[PDB]
Amino acid sequence: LPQRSWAASIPTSALNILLLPSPTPGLVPGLAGSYLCSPLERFL
Amino acid sequence: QQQQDFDPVQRYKMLIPQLKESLQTLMKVAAQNLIQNTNIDNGQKSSDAPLQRFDKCLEEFYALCDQLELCLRLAHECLSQSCDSAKHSPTLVPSLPYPQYLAVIKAQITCAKDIHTALLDCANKVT
Amino acid sequence: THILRDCVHIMKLELFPDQLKWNVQFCLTIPPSAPPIAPPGTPAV
Amino acid sequence: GVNLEAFSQAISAIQALRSSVSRVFDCLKDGMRNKETLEGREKAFIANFQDNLHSVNRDLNELERLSNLVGKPSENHPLHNSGLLSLDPYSQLLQAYKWSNKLQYHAGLASGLLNQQSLKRSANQMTTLVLPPQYVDDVISRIDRMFPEMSIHLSRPNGTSAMLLVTLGKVLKVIVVMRSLFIDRTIVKGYNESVYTEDGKLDIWSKSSYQVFQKVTDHATTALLHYQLPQMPDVVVRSFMTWLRSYIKLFQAPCQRCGKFLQDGLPPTWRDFRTLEA
């Protein structure tokens, strides 16, 4: 409900979606890029 | 950004004594806490010496072990890549032009893909 | 309007609106056809 | 060199460096369940502590390591990265670089397990096992000469069949007169006793030696009559050459003393030892 500044054991199919890089970096309007970009990859 | 000359050998060598001394320190503080609690349960007010909580020290020992492990894994990846590149790729680093090298790489990739497709069709026909 | 030329070029390359519609786009750095001196790290300007 | 693979083992080493200390504290996670026999359980603790010494051994492992570094750093691998953004959608090739290796490695096992064959029959399923062209002989000769420090020569003055001679570090040359494809009916001598360059008038036979290499000649004949695989004559002659190579030393003398007889040799098991014992 509120926010914080520390990370303490957050819990989580979610991993599967977060992994196996998709070729659509979120919005992906379709400009360019023929590379499977992972959400964690693009986040880092 | 680390800028450690990318050479893992002397890094690991110079980092070994850190592991040694950290293990020494953690064993020491563990023995201190042990004698403390063994004087607590049955002795008297003797153990009056604020030492390390043994959490931070052990965890940073694990962390340095982790860093050395990841460095060694990077070193292994690098050497393995060098090995297979030497074993299955000629030496052309400015006698063939870069476009020729790229074309050769693409042709080899296409041949590997063809081999893969042939094996997949074989597995399909088998099933 | 100095960056505007390359901006419109990259936009037309990415969108193809309505090298003669061929591959003409270079916004990156360290090209292979550059004068060989040393492997570049970040040649911008 | 190839010492880099040793670092791989070092990897596992430092892995234990973690596990070890865990195995320490796990051992301290609980006390004596029920000894009832002795107090070596506590010593058992120190036992795990002993394995920590292994970590120090890791530091020692670096003494044998670090032979030398190779020139041209990065080994031409990231040269593709130097390309523009156009080249970056190329890692796939590198993957195949491993994959192909795995392929070979897979065959390295597969072919190995192919050794146990199941061919209940080999005929009545069809030809011309004798090699027609008189050029495959030269091919086999070149393949054999590709081996270093072991020179091979051939003249074939008899006719269609193959005739050749081979020399080694000593003067124990071997003369092999065989058919078109596979090696058979050879002989060996030593110190110009054959002199099969211009012996008398040509590459003579002379079927003789001073009762020293005769056993070696018989053993080589046996090896030729035994290694006659149904196909792949190149493999056969390569195996024959490898077998011949095993006498380049004649120094050791295991499973006996160096006084049993004139000499000692019978390595069909890829290892020579005292003869007259197998």
Side-chain angles (χ1 to χ4, degrees), chain C residues 31-32 39, chain D residues 83 86:
Chain D
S86 278

Side-chain angles (χ1 to χ4, degrees), chain B residues 8-19 21-27 29-41 43 45 49-50 52-55 58-64 66-68 70-76 79-81 84-86 88 90 94 97-99 101 103 107-108 112 118-119 123:
Chain B
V9 172
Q10 79 271 20
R11 193 183 303 119
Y12 158 79
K13 295 284 280 188
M14 82 197 299
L15 279 184
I16 289 152
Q18 279 77 340
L19 296 105
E21 65 93 29
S22 45
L23 195 138
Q24 295 283 349
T25 52
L26 64 86
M27 295 305 190
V29 295
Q32 291 299 85
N33 287 318
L34 259 291
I35 198 180
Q36 171 180 175
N37 51 71
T38 46
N39 207 277
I40 281 182
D41 54 10
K45 286 186 172 177
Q52 297 85 337
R53 68 210 55 85
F54 183 71
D55 168 78
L58 183 138
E59 265 185 292
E60 68 90 20
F61 176 82
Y62 287 173
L64 56 87
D66 194 4
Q67 185 171 1
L68 178 148
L70 66 89
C71 193
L72 212 58
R73 192 66 48 87
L74 185 41
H76 181 281
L79 55 88
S80 44
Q81 288 318 299
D84 72 270
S85 45
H88 287 105
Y98 161 77
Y101 195 102
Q108 200 162 2
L119 270 295

Side-chain angles (χ1 to χ4, degrees), chain D residues 1 6-7 10-16 20-21 24-25 31 34 40-41 44-45 47-49 51-52 54-55 62 71 73-74 76 78 83 86 89-92 94-97 99-103 105-108 110-113 123 128-130 132-133 147-148 150 152-157 159 162 164-169 171-172 174 179 182 185-186 188 190-191 200 205 210 212-213 219-220 223 226-227 230 233 236-237 239-244 247 250-251 253-255 259 264-268 270 273 278:
Chain D
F7 282 167
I11 302 279
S12 84
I14 205 73
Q15 294 318 285
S20 44
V21 312
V24 169
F25 277 45
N34 206 334
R41 51 178 178 85
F45 170 87
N48 303 79
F49 191 74
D51 308 278
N52 303 137
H54 283 66
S55 51
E62 320 310 312
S74 306
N76 203 5
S86 278
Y90 72 95
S91 87
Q92 288 73 235
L94 293 95
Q95 268 93 47
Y97 263 97
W99 192 53
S100 45
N101 294 333
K102 257 61 177 177
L103 263 289
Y105 187 75
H106 180 279
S111 48
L113 277 294
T128 180
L129 270 300
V130 53
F147 199 85
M150 313 303 143
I152 304 96
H153 190 56
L154 82 169
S155 86
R156 304 186 305 170
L164 58 88
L165 74 163
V166 70
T167 79
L168 296 181
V171 200
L172 48 87
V174 195
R179 318 186 67 208
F182 61 93
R185 185 56 265 174
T186 179
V188 69
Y191 184 51
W205 186 285
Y210 49 95
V212 292
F213 297 111
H219 300 342
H226 177 94
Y227 287 171
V236 191
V237 289
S239 159
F240 201 96
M241 288 319 113
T242 54
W243 186 94
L244 292 174
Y247 279 167
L250 300 164
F251 287 151
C255 69
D264 41 353
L266 189 88
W270 306 276
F273 57 92

